[PDB]
Write a protein that binds this ligand. Sequence first.
Ligand SMILES: Nc1ncnc2c1ncn2[C@@H]1O[C@H](COP(=O)(O)OP(=O)(O)O)[C@@H](O)[C@H]1O
Lengths: 481, 52
Amino acid sequence: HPHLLAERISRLSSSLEKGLYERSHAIRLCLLAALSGESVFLLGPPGIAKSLIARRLKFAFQNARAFEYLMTRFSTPEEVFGPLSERLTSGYLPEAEIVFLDEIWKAGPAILNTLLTAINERQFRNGAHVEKIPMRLLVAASNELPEADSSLEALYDRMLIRLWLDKVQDKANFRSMLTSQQDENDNPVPDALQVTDEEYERWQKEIGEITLPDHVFELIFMLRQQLDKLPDAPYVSDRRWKKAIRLLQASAFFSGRSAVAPVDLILLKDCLWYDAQSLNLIQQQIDVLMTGHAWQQQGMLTRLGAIVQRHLQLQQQQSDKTALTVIRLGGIFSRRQQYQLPVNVTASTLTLLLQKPLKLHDMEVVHISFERSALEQWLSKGGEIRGKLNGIGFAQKLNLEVDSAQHLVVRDVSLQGSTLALPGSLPGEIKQQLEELESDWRKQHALFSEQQKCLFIPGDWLGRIEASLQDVGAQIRQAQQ
Amino acid sequence: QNARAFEYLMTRFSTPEEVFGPLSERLTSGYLPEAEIVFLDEIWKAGPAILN
Ligand SMILES: Nc1ncnc2c1ncn2[C@@H]1O[C@H](COP(=O)(O)OP(=O)(O)O)[C@@H](O)[C@H]1O
């Protein structure tokens, strides 16, 4: 039964996208809010099918009445909700399933004060007594943004979904859209896919009963603190976080799942932002968490570094078995020219370990990576040589010299000798920790391949999650070589 | 030991006949005149009759 619900939801939105190109993220987002009792905000230039989406969602229900209205600076509440005689509200707002209000950032004060009570309570003041409003979806579109200190900020804080629609950009999708014969005022949804009034009231009870896992809630446990330490981060109150749980629980209910999935957190990119400055910060902070702390991407990166550090520690401890012999050469030269090993070493940026560690540049080091292009000139011509510490930083100058037993001695500030050595040709402890970390990467990748088929997930976001998981698996495979 | 609560959201459509109780002389059983702890959320939006 729960698995068959994802087929009907995926088939319902397929018929609604007939005639609307590059609008898949706008139709699937309005469908989730219509079946859960939420709202959706649209922002963009006038002329991007912002009014057709308000008239297409009414076809999914058996008994749904649409309402299109443009809020003006001189508009009166008697034209939106209905004029009084006791109020003739036949076919307006109190008895409408889907209402559309274009340009909400310019209405009168009498309309804005009454619009805040029709969302939190879904009631209307019909003169004396009050009556419920069966509003299933509230969509509002405009073009500009409200002021930072005005009376229009109360309605913006209550709107959960805030989408930023724009014009088309693909050339192939523009030719089919420019020449479309599909009627926008017809009914392209079959009767078998239309939901009834009994199914809408039953789904509202099963949404709040969705189990909340502890591992999925760990993402919001850390992402909430990231939006508070940065001054450029938008202010997200507790009312916005409480309404985001209803949208996240309903996203997995219509996808054939019983619990909240970590992949449903991508919908927060259109709910926390509020202007053009917060758009580049919300989409960047979520992308880091979705490619870091989501599928244990960043959790395995910091754990892999401990295995590499442990492997280098065991290599420098057993360096007394393999030394470093430097062969000599004949010829006629004024200086004692030395030659390196032939086929024994062929890498350019090879690493050389050491026995007793020293303090170079007021810091410790365990391995010094030299360059094959500069080692041949120092062993023959002479002079000074450079080299970075711990394989990082700039190539600093060291006190390298030759020894009596054909070895390399590195001195510091206290004239301390240290014979260098090269790493030999995997210990049992390193292979044990590497096998356990590789098993966690395969288990985490299996969870992403079982929940990515959700309908409320954009298509361009799948290319970044797959590329991030492949980067972690490619770094662990290089250490076991 | 004997404390009666009263949780009512103060809305702009609220009337004095609902917060304190409707009249018949006023049915104020379990409202505001006979309550130990009263809670009124959002008080900056009530009417002039309730504020007075
Ligand atoms: N991006 C788009 N893709 C497909 N059709 C579109 C698009 N933008 C507009 N249209 C078509 O243009 C018609 C009129 O749209 P309109 O209601 O003026 O948009 P808006 O409400 O944004 O001004 C609609 O019937 C719709 O089919």
